[PDB]
Amino acid sequence: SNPPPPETSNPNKPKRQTNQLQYLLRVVLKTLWKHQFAWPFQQPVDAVKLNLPDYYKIIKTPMDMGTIKKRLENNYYWNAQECIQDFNTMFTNCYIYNKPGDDIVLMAEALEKLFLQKINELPTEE
Numbered sequence: 001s002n003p004p005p006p007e008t009s010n011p012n013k014p015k016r017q018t019n020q021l022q023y024l025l026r027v028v029l030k031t032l033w034k035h036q037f038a039w040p041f042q043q044p045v046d047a048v049k050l051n052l053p054d055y056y057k058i059i060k061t062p063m064d065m066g067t068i069k070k071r072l073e074n075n076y077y078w079n080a081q082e083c084i085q086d087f088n089t090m091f092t093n094c095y096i097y098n099k100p101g102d103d104i105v106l107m108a109e110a111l112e113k114l115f116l117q118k119i120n121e122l123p124t125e126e
């Protein structure tokens, strides 16, 4: 079976609004979400529907952009680095589970190159 998705809200986790987190939602996530390669990454890997029975035997820290989007919308993150770490987990999982040269890996690599450009332009904390 699929595991439960990663937590996207938590009543005990403190909250704040920052210009860097707003940039991650309004610029970084927005750009990646609408990219033509985004769709396999817009929700948790459904190993049942995709017929990937070993996926969660190999990947123990799943992550996807649907989860990241909810975390940003729900004010789950305290700082930008927590969000950046989640994007990197998503990319790394893809590179670990799949083989170099697979189309899904090429898609992830393209999304990551775009992501790193946008993070290079992260605004300073106000």
Ligand SMILES: CN1C[C@@H](c2ccc(S(=O)(=O)N3CCCCC3)cc2)CC1=O
Pocket: 040, 041, 045, 050, 093, 094, 097, 098, 103, 104, 107
């Ligand atoms: C992040 N993920 C998602 C999982 C997934 C696998 C295959 C398909 S696919 O067969 O639809 N297709 C493959 C070729 C490139 C476009 C998508 C979708 C999702 C695997 C993975 O590491």
